[PDB]
Amino acid sequence: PERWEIRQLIASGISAQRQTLPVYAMRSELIQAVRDNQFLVIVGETGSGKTTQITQYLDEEGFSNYGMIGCTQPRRVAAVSVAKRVAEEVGCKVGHDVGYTIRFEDVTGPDTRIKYMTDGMLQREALLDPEMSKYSVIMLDEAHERTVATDVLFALLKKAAIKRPELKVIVTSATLNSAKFSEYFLNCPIINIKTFPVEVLYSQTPQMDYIEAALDCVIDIHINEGPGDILVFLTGQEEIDSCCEILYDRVKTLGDSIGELLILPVYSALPSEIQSKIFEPTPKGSRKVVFATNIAETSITIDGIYYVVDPGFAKINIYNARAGIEQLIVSPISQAQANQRKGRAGRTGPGKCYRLYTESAFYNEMLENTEIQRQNLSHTILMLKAMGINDLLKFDFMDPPPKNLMLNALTELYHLQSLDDEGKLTNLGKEMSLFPMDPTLSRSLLSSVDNQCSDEIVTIISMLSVQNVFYRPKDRQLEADSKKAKFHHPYGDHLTLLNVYTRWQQANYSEQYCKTNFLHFRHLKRARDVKSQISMIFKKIGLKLISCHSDPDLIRKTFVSGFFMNAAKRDSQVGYKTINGGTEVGIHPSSSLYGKEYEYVMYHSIVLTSREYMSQVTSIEPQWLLEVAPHFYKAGDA
Amino acid sequence: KTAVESIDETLQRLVREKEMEQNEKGIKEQADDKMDLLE
Amino acid sequence: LRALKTNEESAKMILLSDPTITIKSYHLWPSFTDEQWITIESQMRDLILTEYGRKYNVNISALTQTE
RNA sequence: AGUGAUCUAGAAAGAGAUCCACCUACUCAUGU
């Protein structure tokens, strides 16, 4: 096709302030529970004082041995900020008597009694110490957010309790519904604790049309209701942009009789400066209208919201265990999420919440809570086998995943050599478990010394542990693409990651040369700190840093030596076609596709959007597939 | 209440699904007949 | 008549089944009573749609006016 | 300042494998 066009071309031609929180007024009750019970559910209301106060409570009621208390947060920002605040509250130095811990960001020392970490980091600690011996109480907070790392820690700590009487465990939730959690921890007690009282509207009839119904609801609220900001919820950037242009235009129009209305976005890709615009005041004769994803469900506040929409949809990962495949599907929210959404109107006064569905559908048709039934288990089965769990299928899980997705996960880990056939940890599977990565990234990294390019592959695995780096604004895609080309590598977007990191480490720039080379500084910084942490684990575990003199084929072979399974042939009569599953995909419209040695790709990410796409792709010689995983490239199994 | 709306919406969706099935199942039945005779 | 056109002597044996019920000299059809006509019409309808299914391998009429 | 140069043309009977160019066509990451 490229060749034929070239042929036709040739042929042609202060202390007292914290007293005031609600949890103080039940602190007595909260001993008597903590004291009498090895495990305890506590359930609040977000703002009630639990993240701050309850760990402090525990550190007077339960004190000196050589031991700490963990608190666990699903959210890096909540861990960091609440550890800073709680250090002030105690009157102690941050990183000392109170400290963090986050992936490639530790702020603790040999003084730390109270240790506010991500769930993911307590789980990695528990890979290195399956008794968590160094903790005398462990407090799994925001348990309602039912992350993978909290669900695995809940499972683990069930078992660890019946090995260690001197471990007490405190599951803390913002969703009043504890029954499920009590039952799953052997009928354990409950203790149930500043939100104002939200009015709740429902439609009389199922909507079929929720975008235009949400737009008309927001303009109605802006005409008819008194002062108070609006928080819509919508499901992704494209939708959110569209509704920001059309409520900006319709609100200008009704400005001929109605106050001024300032829209904003919010969604996961936004640059920092536009994120900060969400917090602006609410003009002057006037109101404001945040148009957010689920990030505004729990993960922040915006201070003046009095009215919430709620078309009860979000964009959730789903994994089929008998096709083998994740997708990213617009889907009805849980009842717990719908409640959180409602409770964003309520922070600053009474509030209202305008649910674009029936009261029957809230009560009877939303699922209670949403992650173990929506995941590829490969990481999870590596972690369980590091935890010594030899009968995966029997592991005591409050919702067991499909035994087919567990079986598929062992088979992947065997083809990655992390496990032997007999489901037992190889020396790779041990070392891979030492890294806080997915198994394919960890395997790549490990082997990279033996492709003579472990510095290069350290840098690319750091980059692939963060977002996309490349800003492309919808006004200036030509300028952004021009920029991106001055790091691009023709059929090697993994090598493009290496090039833009190296240029970010060049003796020539910082922040403003990120913005003038359309780069996310926040990404590139985070990738630099994860490169530093992962190099420290490499040193710790003896994996020699190695480079060559300049060797792209070595980079290619290393990447294949993790991502072998994620390969995609060019079709020779049709599109592109995949080694696992036999899907029929296209290369993602981010990346051109030099169809002349292209004939196999290795892909980072499969992206489901209305079509099948495969995203961040790099060329591979198919002979180097057959030499670097002969057991996965057996015709025989094909 | 909302039970009447849920039952009527589910009955309408089931009726439209049965109508699409019975449009796949007169003309198109005999088209499948002619195709099976050609097979 | 659709039953006679579809399968002739089967419908003739259905007409000429009961030897008691004869045909008068100026009649064509046998002088049945009304329940006897219900039995004859039911057997003829079953005959029509039986050979229609055995000719065109179609399952059933999915619509009444189609039937 | 230009003119002027204009065939055909149908009746009877009989015959005869046809074998080939006039409608365009492709862009989501819910999070970390």
Curated annotation (Swiss-Prot), chain A:
A GO molecular-function descriptor: ATP binding
The protein's Enzyme Commission number: 3.6.4.13
Compartment(s): Nucleus
Keywords: ATP-binding, Helicase, Hydrolase, mRNA processing, mRNA splicing, Nucleotide-binding, Nucleus
Residues the entry annotates as binding ATP: 44-51
Catalytic reactions of this protein: ATP + H2O = ADP + phosphate + H(+)
Positions of the Helicase ATP-binding domain: 31-193
Keyword field contains Transmembrane helix: no
Cellular-component GO terms for this entry: catalytic step 2 spliceosome; Prp19 complex; U2-type catalytic step 2 spliceosome; U2-type post-spliceosomal complex
Domain Helicase C-terminal: 214-388
Origin superkingdom: Eukaryota
Motif DEAH box: chain residues: 141-144
GO biological process: generation of catalytic spliceosome for second transesterification step; mRNA splicing, via spliceosome; spliceosomal complex disassembly
Other remarks in the entry: Present with 907 molecules/cell in log phase SD medium.
Subunit structure: Belongs to the CWC complex (or CEF1-associated complex), a spliceosome sub-complex reminiscent of a late-stage spliceosome composed of the U2, U5 and U6 snRNAs and at least BUD13, BUD31, BRR2, CDC40, CEF1, CLF1, CUS1, CWC2, CWC15, CWC21, CWC22, CWC23, CWC24, CWC25, CWC27, ECM2, HSH155, IST3, ISY1, LEA1, MSL1, NTC20, PRP8, PRP9, PRP11, PRP19, PRP21, PRP22, PRP45, PRP46, SLU7, SMB1, SMD1, SMD2, SMD3, SMX2, SMX3, SNT309, SNU114, SPP2, SYF1, SYF2, RSE1 and YJU2.
Family under the similarity heading: Belongs to the DEAD box helicase family. DEAH subfamily. DDX8/PRP22 sub-subfamily.
Protein task: Acts late in the splicing of pre-mRNA. Mediates the release of the spliced mRNA from spliceosomes.
Protein name: Pre-mRNA-splicing factor ATP-dependent RNA helicase PRP22
Organism: Saccharomyces cerevisiae (strain ATCC 204508 / S288c) (Baker's yeast)
From Swiss-Prot, chain B:
Subcellular location: Nucleus
Highest taxon listed in the record's lineage: Eukaryota
Induction: Expressed in exponential-phase cells grown in rich medium.
Homology family: Belongs to the CWC16 family. YJU2 subfamily.
Subunit architecture: Component of the spliceosome. Present in the activated B complex, the catalytically activated B* complex which catalyzes the branching, the catalytic step 1 C complex catalyzing the exon ligation, and the postcatalytic P complex containing the ligated exons (mRNA) and the excised lariat intron. Interacts (via C-terminus) with CLF1. Interacts (via N-terminus) with SYF1. Interacts with U2 snRNA; this interaction is direct.
Misc note: Present with 2250 molecules/cell in log phase SD medium.
Job of this protein: Part of the spliceosome which catalyzes two sequential transesterification reactions, first the excision of the non-coding intron from pre-mRNA and then the ligation of the coding exons to form the mature mRNA. Plays a role (via N-terminus) in stabilizing the structure of the spliceosome catalytic core and docking of the branch helix into the active site, producing 5'-exon and lariat intron-3'-intermediates. Further stabilizes spliceosome conformation for 3'-splice site docking (via C-terminus) promoting exon ligation.
This protein's name: Splicing factor YJU2
Originating species: Saccharomyces cerevisiae (strain ATCC 204508 / S288c)
Boundaries of the shown chain within the full protein: 128 to 167 of 278
From Swiss-Prot, chain C:
Function: Functions as a scaffold that mediates the ordered assembly of spliceosomal proteins and snRNAs. Required for association of BRR2 with the spliceosomal U5 snRNP, and the subsequent assembly of the U4/U6-U5 tri-snRNP complex. Functions as a scaffold that positions spliceosomal U2, U5 and U6 snRNAs at splice sites on pre-mRNA substrates, so that splicing can occur. Interacts with both the 5' and the 3' splice site, as well as the branch region. Has a role in branch site-3' splice site selection. Associates with the branch site-3' splice 3'-exon region. Also has a role in cell cycle.
Additional free-text comment from the UniProt record: Present with 468 molecules/cell in log phase SD medium.
Native source organism of the sequence: Saccharomyces cerevisiae (strain ATCC 204508 / S288c)
Full protein name: Pre-mRNA-splicing factor 8
Subcellular location: Nucleus
Range within the parent protein: 2012 to 2078 of 2413
Domain comment in the entry: The MPN (JAB/Mov34) domain has structural similarity with deubiquitinating enzymes, but lacks the residues that would bind the catalytic metal ion.
Subunit field text: Component of the U4/U6-U5 tri-snRNP complex composed of the U4, U6 and U5 snRNAs and at least PRP3, PRP4, PRP6, PRP8, PRP18, PRP31, PRP38, SNU13, SNU23, SNU66, SNU114, SPP381, SMB1, SMD1, SMD2, SMD3, SMX2, SMX3, LSM2, LSM3, LSM4, LSM5, LSM6, LSM7, LSM8, BRR2 and DIB1.
